Symmetry: D2
Subunit: 439 residues, 4 copies
């Protein structure tokens, strides 16, 4: 599945529809970033720039100009064709091919942006710009505006109003289109296959990073070259560290391993977490904590629908966790009083759900305490966890256990669709997958 050219054009038009007459919106590409000396990390395009273009080059800027309520047009600044630079560093779209290829009206060389951008902004009332995201973009925009301001003698005038397009554009990204849902569905499936494979390959004596290796190969195999974030493989006590990425230890017989990994497929993130026994079997104590986390996840999946919120569902999860922890003797007291003192917090210290999309922690307004009412098209994770520190003042069999289980869902008219249910999470299904893989 892919995003069509017609979809990119739709997005641009929807932004233009919300712009004032006499305005221009400026969307800048991400800079290339150094990894060490003259080598660079693999390029990752700014999510917003990508959302409106599908264009994966640096040194580019999209300018949408709304002259009035019917007339509008697009100008792309991008790198010029250069035979030498392309033999060396890769093909460039260039100016001639860009209009037909990206569906923009005009293309100009990026090297000319300071000579041209002020001419595009001249006489407009409003400039839309995401200030403070990239210093290089701010320099370009502020110089343009400064030429216009200081140029009353050449009959230049600057727009007096600057508006951040992020609130509106992030609100657009919060609501996935059917094409985006299908892409995220594929991201979820690829990611689920990677987690399935990790479970099938895991043996005591392997290192955490070996599972990372299996996961990334599976991502790549389906055309998702890069992870959407750094892969976490935390065995034993490392499971109690939420964003553990060192992945450097030998996995022990008798420990759990927690894998939090997600692919990036056509820009969109998958984000799954599975925790499972390194040896293919849960200890009593591991099963007991696992079942509480599973029940929390399974309940959240049943509950999530239009009209509730992350806050409301979180309240039910807390109740389940506190009840479960009291049965096991990890917490002591009355359930309702313990909920009122947030006594679960030493053991479950993060949110249940975040938005998901072109960024793994995707954009969009959550409301106070994530109280925003859910509607169809919203995509989010569900990631309950319990983490019992190695030195926690609790019964001893539970120490050093870190468990999180996470799926990705999209809210529909009647509930939600689970995008990552094709990788097992029921403990008996995990044991059957693994024990079968040993033979």
């Amino acid at each position: 599945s892919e995003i069509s050219r017609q979809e990119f054009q739709r997005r641009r038009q929807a932004l233009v529809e919300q712009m004032q007459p006499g305005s221009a919106a400026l969307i800048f590409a991400a800079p290339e970033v150094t990894r060490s000396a003259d080598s660079e990390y693999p390029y990752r395009q700014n999510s917003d720039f990508w959302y409106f273009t599908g264009f994966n080059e640096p040194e580019a800027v999209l300018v949408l100009i709304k002259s009035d309520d019917t007339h509008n047009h697009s100008v792309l600044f991008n790198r010029v064709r250069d035979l030498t630079a392309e033999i060396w560093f890769g093909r460039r779209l260039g100016q001639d091919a860009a209009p037909e290829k990206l569906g923009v009206d005009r293309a100009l060389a990026f090297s000319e942006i300071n000579q041209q951008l002020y001419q595009l902004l001249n006489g407009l009332d409003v400039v839309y710009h995401a200030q403070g995201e990239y210093a290089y973009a701010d320099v370009i925009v502020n110089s343009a505006l400064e030429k216009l301001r200081k140029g009353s003698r050449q009959n230049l005038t600057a727009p007096a109003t600057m508006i951040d397009w992020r609130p509106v554009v992030h609100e657009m990204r919060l609501f996935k289109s059917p094409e985006e849902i299908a892409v995220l569905r594929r991201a979820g499936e690829i990611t689920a296959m990677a987690h399935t494979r990790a479970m099938e390959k895991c043996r005591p004596g392997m290192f955490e990073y070996h599972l990372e290796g299996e996961i990334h190969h599976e991502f790549n195999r389906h055309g998702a070259r890069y992870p959407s974030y750094n892969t976490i493989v935390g065995s034993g006590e490392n499971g109690c560290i939420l964003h553990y990425t060192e992945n450097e230890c030998e996995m022990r017989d008798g420990d759990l391993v927690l894998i939090d990994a997600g692919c990036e497929y056509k820009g969109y993130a998958g984000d799954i977490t599975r925790t499972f026994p390194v040896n293919g079997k849960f200890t009593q104590a591991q099963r007991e904590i696992y079942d509480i986390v599973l029940e929390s996840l399974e309940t959240s999946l049943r509950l999530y629908r239009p009209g509730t919120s992350i806050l409301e569902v979180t309240g039910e999860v807390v109740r389940i966790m506190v009840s479960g922890l009291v049965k096991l003797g990890i917490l002591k007291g009355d359930v309702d009083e313990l909920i009122a003192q947030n006594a679960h917090r030493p053991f479950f210290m993060h949110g249940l759900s975040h938005w998901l999309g072109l960024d793994v922690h995707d954009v969009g307004v959550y409301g106070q305490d994530r109280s925003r009412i859910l509607e169809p098209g919203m995509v989010l994770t569900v990631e309950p966890g319990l983490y019992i520190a190695p030195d926690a003042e609790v019964p001893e069999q539970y120490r050093g256990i870190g468990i999180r289980i996470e799926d990705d869902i999209v809210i529909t008219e009647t509930g939600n669709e689970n995008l990552t249910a094709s990788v097992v999470k029921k403990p008996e299904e995990i044991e059957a997958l693994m024990v079968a893989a040993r033979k």
Copy 2:
């Protein structure tokens, strides 16, 4: 193979030995860098900081203080132990464990660097600093120096002299120790296994990125998590693009595929290129270009020894390429006259060799036109290539052929050791490897 804590201590001592009495050298960690929004690329430590510490955390600064010709000591700034931040983001070494763990005398909190660095520089004559590498580091240093200049009412004085330590440190990195050679040997072996595997797995209909996938899994399997640079898999006309990284096309029956890939193992880069037929069988035309490149590589491997240079060996490679290209009718004329007008350059447009180490294009002075005399301990690549553009004015059969073959070597007393010879490059050995797979 690995770098011992005692080697890290020896490198620090060798820098201190070169420092003036009454001085301090400052070596800053790399910043974390954004990939998108709040997500970051996997951390890569500054190569020079790493060289002196083996420490893979950001927000750290190594300060070596030479008080005089016999007394010296080290202070590390690094992140404080923080239970919450570690639960969330990973273990930190902290201050208590750092002295014993890294072999430094004192450790202080990085968040205190602005209150403490000026006190360490106060009264010294010289500060050693790599200016312009990281903006955050320059701010810290300039701010410390400024407090000293402007604090005479508090009996503070600034060093009047700042010296770039990079020329000296890079000259040290140019000459590999036996430990380093053994690490680079392992990197070469791991990288070669990855290239072997790519050749064994390649079939028409697979995509370029599938070979990248095979290569990275093999890197990871041997404990080299990350490539030393972005992997190149250029099939067909994509082979004619030197740093082709899109790796997005279907590999066609009848095309060559060029793979440029290297692992990073304990900080050190492997760097191999192999070109081979996607279908396991060179066409006649592909074989004819391949043999010229291979002969260039083989002659280079024969010649590289102490007392010659990259420039000198390049001269021999140019002669082989020009002769070969005349024989095939790609160039027309007298060999010596064609060499004199650099007629090879449309087809071979890059250098033959670069230094190799903590960076794939490693530090160290090359001399004018890479004329520097080679000595034992230098590690370099040998990467001849020929690239015939799809529109080049040459016999039709050679158009769109891009071939590079690259090995990594270390100069020894009597020649060089080839670190990456365990992956085949002879055309018959390539064909035999691919059928057997």
Copy 3:
């Protein structure tokens, strides 16, 4: 005359009246500036900050908050009372006294601005800020907005809209109130007395800077401590340089001296130019150029009124200059063709008029080629000049003559009032003035 507390309060309300509900306008004080090492130039407050406060301290910010269409309030950030710093560097207003003294509702310490400004912008839709004027102000505003953007976990939201208040505020400054016109009148008078005195004191052998000294002492004498711009005293060929400030030569018998100087009185600029013979007698050649410049000025003074423009009046001046220059043989040809070829430009290369106010080159939209229709309340200069270079290809006797004559006017309902007519400009009146002063 001065600007009353009620007037400053009126200006703030007029800005607030134009602001959107749910907004804040931020107006920052000028930074102190180094003259050399640890010494600073005498403080000059930002003109816009001054317009709204009358407050002459650095490290201060005015915040006007419009909660909705009826509720609004003001917060001033300014330097705290500090006994030690004040013993050393001067009295500070501080937080307790500021509300009553400046007519603001609240005052907070400037050192707390990063901890407080974001709290004031939180939940607002619009922030009004003059971006790019001061780097230190941009850093403060951007940090506040950044804390709000990234503080959604703390229920913080940033205004999505930033609007430059300069177009509106500069449009307000373009139209002077009666109190402002009375202040500018006094500035014009003080400045005229300084130019009168310079004419009276000038003798051959004195240096150009001596006249500068006379002028500045006169400004100071009436309570205008500082000039509104760097004084120009160009004798001989130095008169042909428009902003000649070196003022370093001996004034020669036979040369003209051109003096361009203006006081700054309660923030407002006077701006006069007079040119006169160093020896008290215009030669024939000097008098012939002078008369053309004078006729241009006197005619522009009649012409300027509501309904015309600087461009239209400039057209009339060009005609007078070209006709005059043809009569002397400085230009050759037909008058109308020469006008069409802008043949006057080697001799008159600057504008006739600029706005005048808290800045000598005051703010306000001119329109294309200064074509904006004039209305009552606008204040402007009228400054025709003719500058014949020492090597220009003309009758020899005109070489090295630089003459400018400049008055300040305010447009009224039926014409304009000349604010600087109390210093003479008719050549006979100049000669007569120089004769009476030398009898002492």
Copy 4:
């Protein structure tokens, strides 16, 4: 009096003599600074750039190149001749005339500095640069060094060593040459005449700023257009504020007025303070505080010579002040015990002396607590003062009295020469001066 061409050339050679072979020293002009909108304050050249050139234009850089122990040469970057810009804004020296006029070997356009500076630094071992003085200068130098670091392919190499020339140059400025002493002598005399005139013109009912006006007119009259710092005229309680510059109050019959003012003459600062009665007649209480300050100054003037220090002389002044204050009942107790607990500090809270030169608070190392041994050619102020706050707990008649008296001296072989003695400071000479101006 002025600085000759030979002396500017001598200063340059003395710096070059201290430079390492294979090096270049860079000295940058001060930026123009805004006063308001498009108007600028009168240009003030950087003191160090001035010291080595006598050149009063912005957009200029002096480059001294020491090739080896015998060969050296100078390159000036400065503004190009531009007929239009000069008609508008003033004459420029330009490139053709600069060599002969300033005594430099070559002159280039400032607009070419980025294309040329790296070529001058190429292959050198050391660059001397005052880092952190001007941000515009640091950008230029860093950009040059960066082009050189990355230009090994074009056979460029950067100096690996940067040295701050300020310590050496400021040490040169600390020791005045005969030409400099003559110029400072003239500055002292101009400044003394201005203070004499203020005393002669002062009447009750005049404002503080009127005396400022008299002072500045007198500076200007002798060819010193600008003060070396902001003039202070503090009458009454305003005298108790050290750098009181508001100068806005009506001077009252019965008050003292304290005037701290100094001219700038050919770049060098005068710095005088005189305090005197607005009405021309010291009261008993004013005279009593005055005499202690005067004794402190006269004693300092007799003591300052080679081999003592500002710290040592300050100790004597503290003794005089404490004794005097005990005699009046302002301090109570034993003199030596009061000295030991620095009981003078509420009344005398600043230093006795600072260096004087191209900056009023001139450059040069003072040593800890100003303990550096004085030698011939050092120039310094002597400025004892007593300030009794309006609310101080002392006999009523001393409240609100602020008195400072300040002269400028140059240390000589056998003592010092007082550069500002031509303005009276004895209380009976002040009264007689004022009475004579009134008759």
